[PDB]
Swiss-Prot record, chain B:
Domain of life: Viruses
Protein role: Cleaves the C-terminus of replicase polyprotein at 11 sites. Recognizes substrates containing the core sequence [ILMVF]-Q-|-[SGACN]. Also able to bind an ADP-ribose-1''-phosphate (ADRP). May cleave host ATP6V1G1 thereby modifying host vacuoles intracellular pH.
Catalysed reactions, as listed in the record: TSAVLQ-|-SGFRK-NH2 and SGVTFQ-|-GKFKK the two peptides corresponding to the two self-cleavage sites of the SARS 3C-like proteinase are the two most reactive peptide substrates. The enzyme exhibits a strong preference for substrates containing Gln at P1 position and Leu at P2 position
Cytoplasmic topological segments: 1-301
Protein name: 3C-like proteinase nsp5
Subunit-level organization: Exists as monomer and homodimer. Only the homodimer shows catalytic activity.
Subcellular localization, as worded in the UniProt entry: Host cytoplasm; Host Golgi apparatus
Reported impact of residue 248 to E: In strain: Isolate BJ04
Residue numbers of the full-length protein present here: 3241 to 3541 of 4382
Length: 300, 301
């Protein structure tokens, strides 16, 4: 019992974090095998960030420009390249702590653990979600660029995020481990705004099911809806439309409670057009959207 | 910026987790140097849990009754002793991955990280607080017993909690690493309730500061209060009394934000007496009390 946002154990990741320095910029890098991954903007100064020519800046660098420290050990950079918005540094040592891993791109609404790091030193771990507008609501301070997001399957670490920057609304943007940003963001000082965000309907539905499991009942009704009519109302209120896969993901929860997915959609539909109006659901007067069906099931 | 419930990196503890089996009871154990610590109710059968005499049940066991497994390796039990509600198993090999460590008994209102484990295998990590009523609001399922709470300071791991059971209400109860329970609980399968919980005032005030540091000051007001007048309201709303020592602990947050502690108390008083006026604070419709002043400084400095 108990609902808590849980992060995966971070030990396999902690073993891959290093500090990368170029000029006066220090940040975090990920040391896998004989490669170190970090945000390419470490090569920029303040004046460069305004409009950086990254090919040009990399051309003017040398192997010896890049300083990589793992704990007390200086690593020797023996090669450098750039893949999308990531720097890749070849070091003359293979990380003996390298776990089994893969690089995966994650989708909006999905969750992952973040090992916040400063000076190549892990500071803390927490769970968060990729928002529809391709940002995350993390907790990053200066020096945290390079911090990684990941999921764990068996002994295989799936890396899915590397932190690059904080937007002006206080949310966070980064890339997958191929260096491709999530969303339409770029590693430049240009005015950048995340698109207007939407609510992760799938997770709200999971939260509603959890609320029923825990005895909350007042939002249910006898009203009927089709998927299409539900999605039309959902989009009107800045909720994500429900997908086919989504309905099936909710199957277990519907069986467990005996409430059909579309009936729960009917309940949510009403909540959107009226409001909750000061009635609590699971103790809160706002709907939560960062708790997934996988979270509810595994903890119920 | 941003504000998040954050746990310590769990690497150093992960390498201390082992599995302990006695009969068909398997649960988690903590392997430091040549000792494995685990809850003593691993020695009990189904019958035994109802009215256990642990001295009696332990003396009937051998070293060979205990199967200790670290991943692939098997460790050999070469001794045992009971300490309060823990069993301390001596093993033939010392843990090569033993961190620098200390056992501390944390106080209500303090936070720690929990590494929830299953069959000696770490599953998740999260942060929580010792409740004033000596329970924790954790997330535990069957098989989690022996999962540990800890803090990390620099290079030293302070272990403070081992999980023993879930209460009827769904809250969790356990011991420090000398086996003494937090609270009035015992490791016996009978129905046990906690006392009435209170809200950790110090922590709520820290989190209001965090909210301000994160650019949300909507709940501030022009008023102030005396310590004594705040404490009458606290008492009415089931909050812990604020002391001068508590006020002192908030000094740095007060200094950083430029909001005096008693002025933040005024804001809190108004929040308690009127409600949150349909608004959120740091994304929450509830006043959060599981971040300490220390946790806030660490994350917002």
């Amino acid at each position: 019992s108990g609902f808590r946002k849980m992060a995966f154990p971070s030990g396999k990741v902690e073993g891959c974090m290093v500090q990368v320095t170029c000029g006066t910029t220090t940040l975090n890098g990920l040391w896998l095998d004989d490669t170190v991954y970090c945000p390419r903007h470490v090569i920029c100064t303040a004046e460069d960030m305004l409009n950086p020519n990254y090919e040009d800046l990399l051309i003017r660098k040398s192997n010896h420009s890049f300083l990589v420290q793992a704990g007390n050990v200086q690593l020797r950079v023996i090669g450098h390249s750039m893949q999308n918005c990531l720097l890749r540094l070849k070091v003359d040592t293979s990380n003996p702590k390298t776990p089994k891993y893969k690089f995966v791109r994650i989708q909006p609404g999905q969750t992952f653990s973040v090992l916040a790091c400063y000076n190549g030193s892990p500071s803390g771990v927490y769970q968060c979600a990729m928002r529809p507008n391709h940002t995350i609501k993390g907790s990053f301070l200066n020096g945290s660029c390079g911090s990684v997001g990941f999921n764990i399957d068996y002994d295989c670490v799936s890396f899915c995020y590397m932190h690059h920057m904080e937007l002006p609304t206080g949310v966070h943007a980064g890339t997958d481990l191929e260096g491709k940003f999530y969303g339409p963001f770029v590693d430049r000082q240009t005015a950048q705004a995340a698109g207007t965000d939407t609510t992760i309907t799938l997770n709200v539905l999971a939260w509603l099911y959890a609320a029923v499991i825990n005895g909350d009942r007042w939002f249910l009704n006898r009203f009927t809806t089709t998927l299409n009519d539900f999605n039309l109302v959902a989009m009107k209120y800045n909720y994500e439309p429900l997908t086919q896969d989504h309905v099936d993901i909710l199957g277990p929860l519907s069986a467990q409670t005996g409430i059909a997915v579309l009936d729960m959609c009917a309940a949510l539909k009403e909540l959107l057009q009226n409001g909750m109006n000061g009635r609590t659901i699971l103790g809160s007067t706002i709907l939560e959207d960062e708790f997934t069906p996988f979270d509810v099931v595994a903890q119920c």
